[PDB]
Amino acid sequence: SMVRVAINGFGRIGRNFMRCWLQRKANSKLEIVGINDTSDPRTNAHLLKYDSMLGIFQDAEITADDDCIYAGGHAVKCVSDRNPENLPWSAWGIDLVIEATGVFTSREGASKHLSAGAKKVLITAPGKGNIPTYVVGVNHHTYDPSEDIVSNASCTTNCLAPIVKVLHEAFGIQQGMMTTTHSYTGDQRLLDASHRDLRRARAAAMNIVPTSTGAAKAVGLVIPELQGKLNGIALRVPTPNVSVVDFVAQVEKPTIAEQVNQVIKEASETTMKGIIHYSELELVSSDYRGHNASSILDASLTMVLGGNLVKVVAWYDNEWGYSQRVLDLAEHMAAHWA
Amino acid sequence: SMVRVAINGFGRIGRNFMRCWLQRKANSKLEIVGINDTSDPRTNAHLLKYDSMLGIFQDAEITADDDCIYAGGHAVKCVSDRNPENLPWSAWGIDLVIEATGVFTSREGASKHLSAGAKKVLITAPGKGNIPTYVVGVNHHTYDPSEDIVSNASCTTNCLAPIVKVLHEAFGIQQGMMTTTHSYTGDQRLLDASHRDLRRARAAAMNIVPTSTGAAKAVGLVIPELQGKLNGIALRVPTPNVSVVDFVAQVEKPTIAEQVNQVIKEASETTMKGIIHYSELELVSSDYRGHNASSILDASLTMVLGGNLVKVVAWYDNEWGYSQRVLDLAEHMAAHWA
Amino acid sequence: SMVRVAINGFGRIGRNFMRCWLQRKANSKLEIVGINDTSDPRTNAHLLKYDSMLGIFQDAEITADDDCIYAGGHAVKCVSDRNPENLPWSAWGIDLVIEATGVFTSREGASKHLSAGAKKVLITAPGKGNIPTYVVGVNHHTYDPSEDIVSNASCTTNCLAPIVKVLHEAFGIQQGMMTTTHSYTGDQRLLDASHRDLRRARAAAMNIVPTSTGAAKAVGLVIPELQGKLNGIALRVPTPNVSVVDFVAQVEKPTIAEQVNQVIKEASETTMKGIIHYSELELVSSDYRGHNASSILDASLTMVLGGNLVKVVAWYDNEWGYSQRVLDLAEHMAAHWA
Amino acid sequence: SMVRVAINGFGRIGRNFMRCWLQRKANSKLEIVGINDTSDPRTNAHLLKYDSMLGIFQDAEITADDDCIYAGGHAVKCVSDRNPENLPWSAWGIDLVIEATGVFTSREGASKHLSAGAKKVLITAPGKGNIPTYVVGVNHHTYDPSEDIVSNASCTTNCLAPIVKVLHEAFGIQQGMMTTTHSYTGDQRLLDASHRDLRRARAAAMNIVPTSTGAAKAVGLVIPELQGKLNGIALRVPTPNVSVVDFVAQVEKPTIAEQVNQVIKEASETTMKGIIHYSELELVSSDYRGHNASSILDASLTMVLGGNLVKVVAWYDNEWGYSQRVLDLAEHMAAHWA
């Protein structure tokens, strides 16, 4: 009756997701039963417990042997094969793979998990191609249980799309520009080193690094009305977690900063409760470590010019908040498992 | 015949300005003859030579005694009094004070230098009140030699205003929003500590810190047409120097990214040569250390949506590039010294 | 019954101390009744709650008005006067001042609190001059209840002295060298700026910075046998909290690494329980945030050469661990009050 | 006449080495003719020119096409094969490979270059197994021209061994402990991620990270008298380049700090000229970027206790200084070629 889950890629998102589930395990339809990763259970149990961002895991004991990670008695079988086609998904009765490696985001790549026997794959990133893309709180109720491969979009998409949805329905978004000032991630280089992206090649804790954001295209996938009407970039900066998106929209209905804030506040108390948090506090990025919302609107920073040019600024914990939404999407898939 | 200059406040800008002048001394109408600062000549000579950002000064020898800093034979008299009214400006025949403390930006405050005998004051920051404000390359030819107190605006203003001027004349700027992702400065706190600004209170090398930017108001002072039509914020991040401004404008004439770039490129080769640099390279903040331009347009990041919503992104060395412009303004004042 | 406490200087240590007390308040003989600081209660309440290192305080509500900071319904009266002679210690019935400003470490300075009406002062730093100095777990039982001004030494002294005491009693320390690789503190400069210490003047988050360590002299104060037999330095590095001391000792009784570790482990389970923690885990500085021990021996790093040359390495949370010891010392004084 | 060189692994050391050679190319017996690397010439030309640590290369033009990197009109042929056995060393007439990948440090690994047609290999790291190891200024004159694979040891070995040699000859080193407080390197992880070394797994720019130092064993290889008499560790800290070693020695001849400094100063002016620099200046790590010495003794930090316990502290630019020594060793081999 439980949906048996395997994590492919036990990295920042894979381990954040694991810790999210461990804390919510009592009210879950999911059971994490397997991990595939490039490393071994003892190393991965150590990293699961000792986290530079989340701190030491305290809720339960974490141990390992040659074959398993044990999280408070719960045994998670471990394997290590970079080729998903070889994975023991039928042998372990895996229902859902959390695809968190970053390297199987195409349908062809993610489908290797289906070939190995898994029933469904949830990619923790934008998909490449015609992969259904979901943002919880924006369009996840359109998920169809017949879909075998889905995308939870990116961290920035999950922060920006709920805000855009609210603003679009209140004021009509005609065009919108985004810039996320974003913590560095493991895709960037610690010191200057080769990378397909010549700026992500550059020492990440030393530099402001312009690059792409998945939200530039992904928001238009979860709000189809606005497809082609948004664009923007990322500026990676020397913080290890927590990000903030700056969104400037050309809107149809004239407004003022106060009304924009009130509209988002009301949504955060109703249709978007638990997805958008509304804050009037004068905080900084460290203060949002561990926040469960997809988006925290920083209301003091809202601006409007000429009625139609709206600026909003929203925080997000790109590791933990996004992993909470991966878990929410997986729970939703399990609730609607045909 | 030389304009005798005193530096008040031998900080990041005061010392960057000093090093700018030392490198351009052969073609200068200015002679730096005095320093007032909270510290002593030996400490300040050490900091002038050994700079964590600029490296070790190599062009000439820097030494000191109880009374003077010596920069390649050139003797700079030193004093240490926090109250400008007490300074020896008449006794030293000071013509121009470079006001770089951050604490005398009002007319009443800066005028204390005039009381002490200086003839003119150049504030290295936005002024408080009705202080004439200049950006070299935008409106500095409107300087009037009768003005005894002037402002060189802020680093962000000097980066953004030249770009805005070019865009406004080509496309007509109706409204514009700005966010500078900006290196931390000494006004921020190394660890959490009291500050009039509750976010600048927070550990600067640990945090993304939203705060004010002088450019939100100062661009409208140097381009009067756009007064009240621009607004925006700063996000201070954990880099020690070099900043980048993101500008999203609602424009009257529809355009596309290519045309925006070509317009700025042409200006950078003509009316704005030496003020705006045009770059098609995929660089990061470290690469712009020491750049002399007020603005470096990052052309690969230009975006337009719906013809009328324009996004441009420009780099600036907020210490060195700004200090080059302080020097340019002072040279201009000296050239027009009545 | 309660010893009434005022905090002078509501900085990193003042606020860490406050949070230590708030969490240990049920068994305490201390009542924090007053704060003097350069800032106002609203700013200081904000900083008490929102801490970049400790996270958001959530055990109890924290608020403020013009006169008080409120912590879980406990009203803490606030004043703001840089001269301790002016403080309302008589009117507020202050028994004990926690002197955490960094600028009243001499008897003449700290005694201004006594003139103002306090009965005793606990300096959160090495004293200047003849100030009785204590390290809990090393010599705090020698506390003389007639003393009116005492010192809790420094963070590094509290880490190193317990280990030195154990090693000296087991093996006989003849000489010892120390280097603490130490997080930066607020005494250092965010960007290059004047400082009495020409290296602490230098941008703290981008440099390794050699400087003094208070433990070089203070360990010999709390272990008088070893006066003049130890020396060392600090290397300040770009982490905001948690430090590690490297101690190389020349010992009389020849030993080997296994025996050194066994001796310290046994002490940590008995006479040094709660002061020294013994760890064989392969951890890094982030993992010791919030650790309550004065010293965490990193047993895997113990080395011995030739029988008599002993190297031990010990972690410490220089903000929180030290503040726990400040609280322990204040509680000891309150339990031995005269 | 020229010894034809190929760089294998165009990383931090590969590119620092290239830039060292480009600046010393007029007096060289080496010609860099080829590069093998995991990336392509256009990416690698970009990284060679735009360096976050060294700045923009401006001595000569740097460009690239599908097959070559061009440096000042010098065409450097490029290939990309992770297996050295496949490399075109015979066809390109490669005499000497600079082995800078980090993964061919054993004789079996490095010998794949010889199979491919190179005549000798210089490993830019300690060797694994019986690889002749050299430190310029310590034992490079012992070079045996018949050796086909050699090691230049590590950055810390090159800093520490010259100082150890001078101290041993003057005072007799009986035992010695070392700790290098060391910039992070590309072997560490930007965010917590799997690693054979559970501490190097941890986010490098936000942690103090204890780990191994190659100098613990390698100093005894280049000073055979001291084999087994030294030991130590590294503490990796959040700076991107420049490191400092702390060495505490037990010496036979009793001395004092003044005599230790005099002995090292004299060596730095004579037998160790260009290898050890002697400094009495109060500098920090940023100031030693680009320093050409293997070791900079920070004389102000020298301490002695009891005559026989000696502490010295020495800086080194672990990228650039080490690469200068790689170039020095390669030039020595080219001058003693057989």
Ligand SMILES: NC(=O)c1ccc[n+]([C@@H]2O[C@H](COP(=O)([O-])OP(=O)(O)OC[C@H]3O[C@@H](n4cnc5c(N)ncnc54)[C@H](OP(=O)(O)O)[C@@H]3O)[C@@H](O)[C@H]2O)c1
């Ligand atoms: N970090 C964020 O803020 C964030 C937010 C939203 C989404 N995401 C997405 O989540 C994915 C993972 O990102 P991350 O930050 O967690 O990166 P990460 O820390 O590198 O995690 C990826 C993990 O997958 C492992 N791995 C790589 N290739 C594999 C393969 N073929 N088979 C099995 N395991 C493999 C990696 O091992 P190695 O370390 O040995 O390579 C690592 O353990 C990416 O798609 C990323 O874009 C990231």
Ligand SMILES: NC(=O)c1ccc[n+]([C@@H]2O[C@H](COP(=O)([O-])OP(=O)(O)OC[C@H]3O[C@@H](n4cnc5c(N)ncnc54)[C@H](OP(=O)(O)O)[C@@H]3O)[C@@H](O)[C@H]2O)c1
């Ligand atoms: N840094 C930038 O990127 C930048 C760019 C453009 C403009 N500015 C503006 O330039 C000004 C200085 O900024 P900064 O970054 O150079 O700061 P800074 O490094 O703190 O420099 C200010 C200097 O003035 C000294 N000082 C303070 N009060 C004084 C007084 N009453 N009399 C004499 N000297 C006094 C300070 O001494 P202490 O260190 O002892 O306080 C310090 O040496 C501010 O207005 C700032 O907003 C800064």
Ligand SMILES: NC(=O)c1ccc[n+]([C@@H]2O[C@H](COP(=O)([O-])OP(=O)(O)OC[C@H]3O[C@@H](n4cnc5c(N)ncnc54)[C@H](OP(=O)(O)O)[C@@H]3O)[C@@H](O)[C@H]2O)c1
């Ligand atoms: N941080 C550590 O790891 C550590 C560990 C052990 C001991 N200590 C010692 O503890 C003391 C404080 O260190 P810290 O790191 O907490 O420094 P800090 O963050 O600068 O805190 C000092 C506090 O005192 C305030 N202050 C300064 N002068 C004052 C005056 N005359 N009257 C009232 N308030 C005044 C400061 O205000 P402003 O911010 O306006 O100056 C600040 O709030 C020093 O003796 C330090 O060496 C520090």
Ligand SMILES: NC(=O)c1ccc[n+]([C@@H]2O[C@H](COP(=O)([O-])OP(=O)(O)OC[C@H]3O[C@@H](n4cnc5c(N)ncnc54)[C@H](OP(=O)(O)O)[C@@H]3O)[C@@H](O)[C@H]2O)c1
């Ligand atoms: N950095 C220092 O301070 C320092 C000092 C002295 C000695 N060393 C030693 O020098 C070596 C390199 O260190 P580093 O810091 O320069 O490391 P790095 O930046 O990672 O450089 C290594 C280079 O080799 C490439 N590479 C790896 N495997 C390869 C293969 N099979 N064929 C071709 N190219 C390959 C890497 O590509 P990828 O980026 O794609 O992996 C990278 O370009 C190591 O032995 C290191 O211990 C380092």
Ligand SMILES: [Mg+2]
């Ligand atoms: Mg199958």
Ligand SMILES: [Mg+2]
């Ligand atoms: Mg006068």
